[PDB]
């Protein structure tokens, strides 16, 4: 009743420990290092691993090792192997290029359609386009490159297809098998891999992991291949076709082989080397932009990083691999020294590849995802950290003081910015007189008028507690799908019980029974499920009674995720909790954590170790001022009071330490590689936002002892400064000169202000420069922006980012990740053929092959085609197909992306887009003209279509909570299910038997409170949906809804309180009949009679698509009147023409640039970015720092609600109801604080997170700077015929439309249009006027859902709190 | 000129009480939390004086 | 009325002497001691007894050396080696430089010689 | 006058902040148990008593 | 009386007297320590005043503004 479904995709990482012990077990001796996990392997091996050693072909590998036969190796070696491998037959050479040919013709034939249906609306114009004609004509012929990695691919895939089959069906399957790849010999398991070739004599050992990582390779090798073969066709038909790039794929190949070699000559050290290659594609790219000071130090630098990264691989490997069963394996160029010249070929190739263009050397980032990941050795990553965090520092008592003055500044200046006002000090006699007046006044001298002095003098401030803490902890903060560490004394149950001593596992077993079961839950999820002693106010009292301080259950657990830390779960809800509050209160102080010449500089700094040199004395001087602004002691400054008194261990798998007996305690086992104590803070991860304003800090006092200026921006662990200085120009000195000075000084600064705090730079993470900067991966030089978009779709495929191998989240993932090469890459068509590609494989090839339903879903999916066949009148079940992949998702076709998505990015209504689309799509059979208006041409296949739309037979249920959830969904059965509707049901029953109370009453009263919810708002007349979610998300059920959305994306809802990480059958089914469901919509909506023959059919003369939309959205729900959703979509209303007009009567494009070619150009106009309208409301005057932050979000609801409800004839009552209920006020004493809505129409400007914010173009926002649009005589016409009132046509999605039609027609025809000209529909644009709501609301079944639901409420505003509001 | 020496004075003596204040906070360290002596030396705040408030408001019913 | 400018020299002085004895003040951190059992104060001494603590190895350190020139105001030559004009290189990096300079194929090799 | 009695106070009270911040460093640069139990002692009773003093002032109508 | 200064004076040789006292403590070890924890001036009742003073402040403020109420 409990299968096993594997990874299909490397998610985890390769274990150095894992790999190690099998092999130690099986070549019996140290393999890979001579530690501890080779001796406990060997002495008390796995039962998986004695599974493994004890087949029969096993046992013949290693009886023909001990005799001196076979030799070991490396998994580089290997690897290298594989990649090279060309071995095939005629036969197989011919069935390869067979079904690459046939996958390459039928991509080239869907992708017809839609670049039909674009020739065909833009006025422009098996295969009816020329276009696609003479792209066809050349890729007729695959090149040898290509088919090399296609035919790995291919093979590594079905191999592992086959594994994973079998281990669904059977459990404890082992995959033997030398007949898949020729020459190799595979034993797969998901316990280990064991790899043989006979004719070379080798054998290696490894993981299941690494087995996913060569694949993972191949596929990212033919997808590369793939991309730049498609794009350099097309550039060879028209040179802005394809990319902006452009490669040699005899290169390319070269490059992938030269890396394979470096690899297995250096064995996993040469990833070091592999590391250092970034610095050289950026020194390539330097030598471009920058002046030679620079770029000569850079290439000098850059030089040093490499050859010693090259040598410290050579020391290393030399070192390991030297008493363990590899000593024999290491090379003879690696002591000759003659490795360097392998090096050298493996630079140049780059700078051919890079070819002197900034195109080329962008792209070529992706070079460093190519080559596969190391092991990561665990144990030593430790040895190399506590060094550093164990360190002593010492520091001036001037620097602490200068750096808390400087935080202290940052904290008077954003006060009286924000608040109008000076924080409230207790000790304010220490200011002397200035800083008095400055109090006084409510001022703040600038940072060219301040001091050292002054800020030691600020140094010596305490704080009065500004802001408050919430008291009733928050659930969706702290709960998780992640993993937690046991106790201090359960740490032992990490590790295998076979790895650890006999007086462990008699002790283990003992102290498990004076634990709960929530301490032993292995699980945050299953933590926080188990407590059967929960309380809202206990994370409150934590922290207020500091109970995390002595604490002898605390420990920090390492594991290889860069060491990924863990705690027990009390710390780390106070962990979550001190960052919140940083996040929330103190980030608005810390915006950028978010005289004859002006010289000007930029330093670049690498902050990734930035907190290993992080002490108590520089941390906490800081953090005592946020505790104190608190009213708390020791949140802020929890780690550096708690972690020098415990216990750092790794708790990987397979690397247990080493306990002498007599020993159970943590704190009494020797220190060894992997265990230790003392450390001086600085766990990553933790605690950064604190170390981000401490940094800004410091750069405000390094400003002010430079006197220059600083433009700061931290950006995760990677800072950027700018510095610019007034300077008087020399005698024959020039500008650069100038600039290559003031880096000099700065950076000498730079570097004696860190050291002075403890943190002493290298040259490594830092380097200088004058303009450019390379913007947390975004090269950008003279305002063009150059992208990195091939290394975005390197693993497309398949199954990807999907839960039991859905369909429709894989297709939704390849369609997501394809469009990147279309609004990066600025190619419509590539990212077109690459999408199609890959969306063909997926349905037509490996549908049949699915893991769970074995080929149900290809069953279902040749019904869908003959039916298609059928209601179309097509011609054979290969046109069907095209015809299935075009059509929208939402209909129950295949199609991921919609063509408005090439235009804008952002719609208000989808339903109207997915019409539009269909009927675009429909013209390629149906030959209807996209310019012309909608006839009846002798061909009912349209007519058909719509007909079958608007006829349906009526069957709607439990609209009002469907309607709050998703205000676009559709009802009566007329769309496609998602995940959260079919496992709901699930989760609220297996949540309905926790032993946590709070979740066990909320999901008994699931079903009841969803009826009230319905039973609520049903007798307002008009229905507005966007308001219904306004009233969803203002009550308590809001909370419960996201929490069980959280638990019901997991594997295997009902296993949850079961310790198993196996799948029930159940769910299988579940999943199951929810994929055949889904793929059979279309024969549901699409009938073979039109729902009767004698309906007349649709007339398509004098049709419009919106009231079409309207009315199908209207009848699936029974519902009179929908108002606010429905929106005309840009693609379908406005005609495109290219000549001037004798009145033009349209919104005018025109291009700014002189050239006749824009891409990769900046023009004079201002970037275009959407950009919704700013709210006009009337903001009242209080204290809004008394009031937490979720308070102040229930108050913004309740003033929209009161905003677009204020009509109906139950108004007082309703917001009195909800203002107690919620908030704890009454309505008289609650609307003091609502804001006030200067605004008319609330369906224009409604803020709901169900609406766009932002309506943005399907381009670079650099490209948009070369055209300017003007919209005058398009208002003249809208205000004759309808004045001054408001209309359902957004502005931002037109001029949005405007600009992408620039960019696709010069894309197309290879030369930018002069001037566009938009000219609309005006039978699809409607009025949109707010209502005068009629009926009145549910008071018994509001109350009823505030009571039933009542855990989840937040926290009232209270009568200290409110008196203090206006004092 | 007796005004201004004072002025003097006091600005000396901000500078003290700002490296002195500095040298107490970076001196309650992970040792004094340990040895329980931390809030001797930092204060008491708002929230331990609520809940000695409440305490004392409240001893067993009101 | 010679008494108030006396003694607003005398005070002036002692003001002049805290500050310049709290100017000269090294605090160095909380850390674990030698023959690691547990954790030990952090320490405020002045600058010449902590530079001897540092120099005695009293308070163990790895960067001795340039600790002592950093608290002493001064920078050594790896701080203006960090911070120089051109940067100089090493001698695996002049030969990759030499051979990296000039296709002239002084590589001499190919992926067969393995 | 005023402003020099004025600034004589306040020279008065920053003198005292200085010798208390003085007495609270050397009294915490103790390390061995003798005086930060002291110490600890001394804040369980300043706790009672604060107690004590809050009732009895609440106590008052 | 504005040969106050007097005190002022006074006080400030106190100051200057505990400061020396503070950097010789920390340097104590094998140094300036025939005992441990090195002769002192016997001075914890001044601090716990101190807190006490602070914290009756801090509560005078709490109860002002929960009288409000």
């Known amino acids: 009743a409990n299968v096993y479904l594997t990874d299909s995709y490397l998610k985890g990482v390769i274990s150095f420990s894992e790999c190690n012990a099998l092999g130690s077990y099986i070549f019996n001796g140290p393999y890979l290092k001579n530690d501890y996990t080779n001796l406990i392997s060997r002495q008390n091996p796995l039962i998986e691993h004695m599974n493994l050693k004890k087949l029969n072909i096993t046992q013949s590998l290693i009886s023909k090792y001990h005799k001196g036969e076979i030799k070991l190796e490396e998994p580089t070696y290997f690897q290298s192997l594989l990649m090279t491998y060309k071995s095939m037959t005629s036969s197989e050479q011919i069935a390869t290029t067979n079904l690459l040919k046939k996958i390459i013709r039928r991509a080239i034939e869907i992708s017809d359609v839609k670049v039909y249906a674009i020739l065909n609306k833009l006025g422009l114009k098996t295969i009816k386009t020329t276009l696609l004609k003479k792209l066809m004509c050349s890729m007729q012929h695959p090149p040898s490159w290509l088919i090399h990695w296609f035919n790995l691919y291919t093979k590594l895939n079905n191999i592992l297809t086959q594994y994973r089959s079998n281990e669904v069906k059977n459990h404890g399957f082992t995959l033997i098998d030398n007949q898949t790849l020729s020459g190799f010999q595979f034993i797969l398991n998901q316990y280990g891999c064991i790899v043989y070739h006979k004719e070379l004599k080798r054998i290696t050992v490894t993981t299941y992991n690494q087995f996913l990582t060569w694949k993972d390779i191949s596929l990212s090798r033919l997808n590369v291949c793939l991309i730049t073969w498609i794009s350099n066709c097309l550039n060879t038909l028209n040179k802005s076709l394809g990319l902006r790039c452009g490669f040699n794929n005899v290169i390319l190949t070269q490059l992938f082989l030269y890396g394979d070699c470096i690899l297995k000559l250096f064995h996993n050290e040469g990833f070091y080397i592999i590391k250092e290659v970034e610095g050289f594609i950026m020194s390539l790219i330097l030598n471009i932009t920058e002046e030679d000071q620079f770029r000569k130090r850079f290439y000098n630098s850059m030089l040093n990083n490499i050859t010693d990264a090259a040598n410290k691989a050579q020391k290393n490997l030399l070192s390991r691999v030297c008493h363990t069963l590899l000593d024999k394996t290491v090379s003879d160029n690696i002591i000759n020294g003659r490795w360097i010249i392998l090096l050298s070929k493996f630079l140049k190739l780059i700078k051919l590849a890079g070819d002197n263009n900034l195109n080329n050397l962008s792209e070529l980032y992706f070079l460093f995802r190519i080559f596969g990941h190391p092991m990561v050795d665990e144990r030593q990553a430790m040895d190399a950290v506590k060094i550093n965090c164990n360190e002593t520092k010492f520091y001036l008592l001037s620097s602490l003081s200068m750096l808390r003055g400087a935080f202290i500044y940052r904290i008077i200046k954003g006060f009286v910015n924000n608040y109008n006002r000076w924080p409230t000090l207790r000790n304010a006699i220490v200011l002397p007189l200035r800083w008095l007046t400055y109090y006084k006044l409510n001022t703040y001298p600038s940072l060219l008028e301040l001091t050292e002095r002054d800020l030691i003098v600020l140094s010596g401030l305490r704080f009065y507690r500004e802001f408050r803490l919430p008291k009733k902890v928050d659930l969706e903060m702290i709960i998780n799908d992640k993993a937690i560490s046991p106790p201090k004394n359960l740490i032992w149950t990490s590790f295998p019980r076979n790895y650890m001593p006999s007086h462990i596992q008699n002790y283990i077993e003992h102290e498990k029974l004076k634990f709960s079961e929530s301490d032993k839950s292995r699980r945050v999820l299953e933590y926080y499920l188990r407590d059967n002693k929960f309380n809202e106010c206990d994370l409150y009292n934590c922290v207020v009674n500091q109970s995390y301080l002595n604490n002898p259950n605390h420990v920090v657990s390492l594991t290889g995720k860069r060491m990924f830390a863990m705690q027990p779960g009390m710390f780390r809800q106070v962990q979550i909790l001190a960052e919140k509050m940083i996040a929330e209160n103190i980030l608005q102080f810390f915006p950028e954590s978010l005289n004859n010449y002006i010289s000007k500089c930029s330093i670049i700094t690498d902050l990734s170790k930035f907190n290993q040199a992080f002490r108590y004395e520089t941390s906490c001087i800081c953090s005592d001022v946020l505790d104190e602004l608190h009213g708390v002691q020791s949140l802020f400054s929890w780690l550096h009071l708690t972690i020098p008194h415990v216990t750092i261990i790794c708790t990987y798998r397979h690397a247990p330490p080493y306990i002498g007996d007599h020993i159970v305690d943590l704190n009494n086992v020797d220190e060894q590689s992997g265990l230790y104590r003392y450390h001086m803070g600085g766990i990553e991860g933790w605690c950064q936002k604190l170390w981000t304003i401490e940094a800004i800090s410091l750069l405000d006092l390094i400003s002010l002892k430079g006197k220059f200026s600083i433009t700061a921006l931290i950006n995760g662990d990677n800072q950027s400064i700018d510095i610019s200085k007034p300077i008087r120009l020399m005698e024959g000195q020039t500008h650069a000169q100038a600039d290559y000075l003031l880096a000099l000084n700065s950076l000498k600064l730079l570097y004696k202000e860190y050291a002075g705090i403890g943190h002493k730079l290298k040259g490594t993470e830092t380097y200088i420069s004058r303009d450019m900067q390379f913007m947390s991966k975004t090269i950008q030089h003279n305002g063009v922006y150059y992208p990195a978009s091939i290394k975005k779709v390197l693993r497309v495929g398949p199954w990807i980012n999907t839960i039991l191998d859905d369909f429709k989240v894989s297709l939704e993932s390849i369609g997501s990740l394809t469009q990147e090469l279309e609004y990066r890459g600025e190619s419509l068509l590539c990212s077109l053929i690459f999408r199609n590609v890959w969306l063909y494989n997926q349905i037509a090839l490996q549908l049949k092959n699915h893991a769970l339903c074995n080929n149900k879903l290809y069953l279902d999916i040749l019904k869908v085609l003959k039916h298609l066949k059928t209601f179309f009148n097509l011609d054979n079940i290969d046109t069907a197909l095209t015809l299935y992949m075009n059509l929208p998702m939402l209909f129950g076709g295949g199609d991921p992306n919609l063509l408005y998505r090439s235009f804008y990015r952002r719609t208000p209504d989808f339903l109207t887009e997915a019409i539009v689309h269909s009927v675009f799509i429909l013209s390629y059979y149906t030959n209807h003209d996209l310019k012309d208006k909608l006839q009846d041409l002798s061909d009912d296949r349209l007519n058909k279509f719509l007909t079958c739309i608007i006829t349906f037979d009526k069957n709607p249920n439990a609209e009002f909570v469907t309607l709050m959830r998703d205000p676009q969904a559709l009802g009566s059965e007329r769309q496609a299910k998602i995940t959260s509707e079919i496992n709901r049901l699930a989760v609220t029953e297996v949540l309905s038997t926790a032993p946590n109370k709070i979740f066990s009453k909320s999901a008994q009263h699931y079903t009841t409170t969803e009826i009230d919810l319905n039973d609520i708002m049903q007798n307002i007349e008009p229905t507005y949906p966007h308001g219904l979610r306004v009233v969803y998300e203002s009550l308590p059920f809001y909370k419960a809804e996201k929490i069980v959305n959280l638990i019901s994306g997991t594997k295997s809802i009902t296993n949850i309180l079961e310790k198993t990480s196996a799948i029930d059958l159940t769910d299988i089914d579940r999943a199951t009949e929810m994929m055949r469901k889904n793929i059979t919509l279309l024969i549901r909506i699409l009938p073979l009679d039109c729902n009767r023959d004698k309906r007349e059919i649709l007339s398509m003369e004098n049709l419009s698509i919106t009231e079409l939309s309207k009315y199908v959205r209207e009848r699936s729900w029974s519902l009179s009147n929908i108002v606010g959703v429905t929106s005309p979509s840009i693609m379908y209303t406005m005609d495109i023409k290219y000549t001037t007009s004798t009145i033009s009567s349209g919104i005018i494009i025109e291009k700014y640039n002189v050239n006749s070619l824009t891409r990769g150009e900046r023009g004079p106009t201002k970037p275009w970015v959407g950009s919704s309208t700013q709210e006009k409301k009337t903001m009242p005057v209080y204290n809004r720092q008394v009031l937490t932050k979720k308070q102040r979000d229930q108050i913004d609801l309740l003033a929209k609600l009161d905003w677009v409800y204020a009509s109906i004839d139950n108004k007082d009552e309703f917001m009195e109801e909800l203002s107690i209920g919620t908030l704890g006020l009454t309505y008289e004493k609650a609307k003091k604080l609502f804001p006030q809505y200067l605004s008319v129409n609330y369906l224009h400007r409604l803020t709901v997170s169900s609406r766009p914010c932002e309506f943005p173009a399907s381009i670079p926002a650099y490209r948009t700077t070369n055209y300017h649009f003007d919209t005058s005589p398009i208002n003249r016409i809208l205000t004759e015929k309808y004045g001054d009132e408001d209309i359902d046509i957004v502005f931002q999605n037109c001029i949005s439309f405007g600009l992408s039609l620039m960019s696709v027609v010069e894309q197309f025809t290879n030369v930018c249009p002069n001037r566009i000209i938009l000219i609309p529909k005006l039978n699809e644009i409607h009025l949109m006027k707010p209502p005068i709501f009629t009926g009145d609301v549910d008071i018994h079944k509001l109350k009823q859902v505030i009571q039933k639901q009542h855990m989840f409420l937040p926290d009232k505003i209270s009568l200290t709190q409110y008196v203090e509001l206006f004092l | ?62």
């Open chain 2, 1 to 62: 000129n007796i005004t201004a020496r004072l002025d003097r004075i006091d600005e000396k003596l901000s500078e003290i009480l700002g490296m002195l204040h500095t040298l107490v906070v970076a001196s309650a360290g992970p040792t004094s939390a340990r040895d329980g002596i931390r809030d001797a030396m930092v204060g008491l705040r708002e929230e331990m004086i609520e809940k000695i408030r409440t305490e004392a408001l409240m001893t067993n019913d009101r």
